[PDB]
Amino acid sequence: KPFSVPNIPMNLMSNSRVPMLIDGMMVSNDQVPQFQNGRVTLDGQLQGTTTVSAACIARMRGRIFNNNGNYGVNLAELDGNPYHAFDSPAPLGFPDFGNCDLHMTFVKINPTELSTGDPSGKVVIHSYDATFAPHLGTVKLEDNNELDQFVGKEVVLELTWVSNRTGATLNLWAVPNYGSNLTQASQLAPPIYPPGFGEAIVYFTSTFPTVSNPKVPCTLPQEFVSHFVNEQAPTRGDAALLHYVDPDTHRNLGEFKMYPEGYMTCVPNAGPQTLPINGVFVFISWVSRYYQL
Amino acid sequence: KPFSVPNIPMNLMSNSRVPMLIDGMMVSNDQNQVPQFQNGRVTLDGQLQGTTTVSAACIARMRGRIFNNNGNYGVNLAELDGNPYHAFDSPAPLGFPDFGNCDLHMTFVKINPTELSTGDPSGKVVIHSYDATFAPHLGTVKLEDNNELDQFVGKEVVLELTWVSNRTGATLNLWAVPNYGSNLTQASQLAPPIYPPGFGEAIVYFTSTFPTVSNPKVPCTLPQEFVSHFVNEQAPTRGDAALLHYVDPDTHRNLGEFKMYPEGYMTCVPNGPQTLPINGVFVFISWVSRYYQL
Ligand SMILES: CC(=O)N[C@@H]1[C@@H](O[C@@H]2O[C@H](CO)[C@H](O)[C@H](O)[C@H]2O[C@@H]2O[C@@H](C)[C@@H](O)[C@@H](O)[C@@H]2O)[C@H](O[C@@H]2O[C@@H](C)[C@@H](O)[C@@H](O)[C@@H]2O)[C@@H](CO)O[C@@H]1O
Ligand SMILES: CC(=O)N[C@@H]1[C@@H](O[C@@H]2O[C@H](CO)[C@H](O)[C@H](O)[C@H]2O[C@@H]2O[C@@H](C)[C@@H](O)[C@@H](O)[C@@H]2O)[C@H](O[C@@H]2O[C@@H](C)[C@@H](O)[C@@H](O)[C@@H]2O)[C@@H](CO)O[C@@H]1O
């Protein structure tokens, strides 16, 4: 197959780290990305905790437990099948926000528990301390006095909002310590560094209640991820040249280079000006690493 | 472009009515039941209908500013990106839940960055998808007062569907079309009903387990990723129906034939699809007659 990117305007696609529309892109004004969601090669090989559907982003699933005066969740994949530690740092879709407080909303998910009554709850999960061990299959839940009815029950959890850990700032580039003190989590997606030639990594942004820093950056729109998995197009050069074009006239508004590892770069600040957010990325051709933006 | 469907296993795709993985297929109990879902609606050549969006990130969500008029609380709706809802193209803002005549239990957060510097931005609220006060087509819905809304009055929030329950006195009917409201002479903008094909065929529904309490299985007529695929491709529709095979991802054995119609739904001839494994991949075989015999 010939390589391509989605022919969908940027502002109709989802962030890959939270399920929110993209409302911008930017280079970092400071900070190394090693996100575990939104990670895929250009030839369609998923990495980290990344999966296909935006319906999976920043969610968890598992059975709530209570032991030794502490609550937690025994994790599974979002479809209810078991999580195998060999395959990934955590179950697919697991939030990749580290060293912070994850404020989750959850619902019972067993049909037999969904015939009557309110199946919903909320809970805080720290993405820190040794009891945060999703690679080992478990995470601690903060006791809010409203978890007892859910002990022994299977639930699905979604990330509602995020706040800083007491004594620390909220760092959206922090990598969660998935393997606790036991091991480095298997199959972590690697850190990304810019290649040179004045180039800077591009982040796609969404406004989201990461309180104190409500702009979540990711390295690929989720629909790019599913596109590459669908296509499995062979990588045929150092970089894929993209033009970001006017959605109606197809005039080029700016050039980008996508690298095989699954991220893109630009040379920013080429006269003050602002790119619109409703443009469309179009694959032009494979180009050498020396292509100058 | 030549026509195609996603080369993704069914169980990795999302329902189009709730953001949940598909975990089954079914045919309706009454094979003459007419679905008129407003999400997951698209033609085979990529024209969106109803409240259908490209991204699964929009499914069953709302956005707007909370108000309090004399003790009556509500939301003045906008599109999910915060731009105004103009009602040009859809019966409600894109992504709006299409569950009718029931109680929508929403979780919400303030979404203005200036309101996201400190503190807990979150809340929850019930919204009835019934009565004249449920009028998303006219840009407003009533919120049930839970005594915890006042801090949010005048604030912009985004809402998401956490769970659903039946309206007192009624069953939870997941085939019900919400009454989105009428605006004088303006078109409803509703995606059309899909009438059962008959003659042995039955509409295929993709299902997800979800907390629609008392009926925890949500049916839809297309996986969400089919929608974005068709929008992306804009492939001319060259026949009156598309023949698909549902294939084992390993053996590549054909597990069953399906017909996809230009209006954006699928049928089969049950002998039903509920018994098929859920990890198969749909593959476009050929354009066929509207009358092609499965
Ligand atoms: C006010 C209240 O607590 N009512 C309880 C019933 O729950 C309500 O039932 C309504 C339909 O008759 C409607 O679905 C409401 O949304 C629902 O209220 C929700 O659920 C309850 C448990 C509370 O958490 C509320 O705060 C919430 O808004 C309840 O009915 C039973 O559960 C509901 C979910 C539904 O499945 C219904 O069919 C069940 O009979 C009954 C019985 O447990 O108790 C209260 O009356
Ligand atoms: C227990 C409590 O109410 N604490 C308040 C602070 O909120 C907590 O702050 C923690 C970091 O120091 C951490 O982020 C917690 O998650 C957070 O608690 C959450 O938010 C509060 C408001 C409550 O709703 C809790 O139930 C919830 O778990 C609070 O800190 C300020 O807000 C938080 C969210 C964070 O942005 C922080 O940087 C802010 O200073 C302070 C100040 O208002 O008041 C309490 O101590």
Residue numbers in the entry:
A (entry chain A): 230 to 259, 262 to 501, 504 to 526
B (entry chain B): 230 to 500, 504 to 526
How do the authors describe this structure?
NoV VP1 has two principle domains, the shell (S) and the protruding (P) domains, linked by a short, flexible hinge. The S domain builds the interior shell that forms the basic structure of the icosahedral capsid, while the P domain dimerizes constituting the arch-like protrusions extending from the shell. HuNoVs recognize histo-blood group antigens (HBGAs) as attachment factors or receptors which play an important role in the host susceptibility to huNoV infections. BV, a clinical isolate, bound uniquely to the Le, but not the A and H antigens, making the BV distinct from other tested GI NoVs that bind generally the A and H antigens.
In this study, the crystal structures of the BV P dimers in complex with the type 1 Leb and the type 2 Ley antigens, respectively, were resolved. The BV P dimers in complex with type 1 Leb and type 2 Ley tetrasaccharides, respectively, were crystallized in the same space group and unit cell dimension of native protein and thus may be viewed as isomorphous with the native crystal. Fourier difference maps were calculated from diffraction intensity Fcomplex − Fnative combined with phase angle derived from final native protein structure, which unambiguously reveals the high resolution electron density maps of the bound tetrasaccharides. Two symmetric HBGA binding interfaces are identified on the top of the BV P dimer at the common boundary between the two P monomers, sharing similar locations with the other three known GI binding interfaces. The conformational binding interface of BV is composed of two major areas, a β-Gal binding site and a Le epitope binding site, formed by ten amino acids from 3 (P-, T-, and S-) loop regions. The β-Gal of the precursor makes a major contact with the “bottom” of the binding interface, which is stabilized by residue T397, while the Le epitope, the α-1,3/4 Fuc (Le Fuc), contacts with another part of the “bottom” and is stabilized by the other “wall” (S346′, T347′, G348′ and D349′) to support the binding outcomes. In fact, BV does not form a single H bond with the H epitope in binding to the type 2 Ley antigen, while only one water mediated H epitope between D349′ of the P-loop and the H epitope was seen in BV binding to the type 1 Leb antigen. Finally, BV also forms a water mediated H bond with the N-acetyl glucosamine (GlcNAc) of the precursor through T347′ of the P-loop in binding to the Leb antigen, a scenario that has not yet been observed in the other three GI NoVs. In fact, the H epitope of the Leb and Ley antigens played a minor role in the binding outcomes as it does not at all participate in binding to Ley, or interacting with the Leb through a single H bond among the eleven H bonds in total.
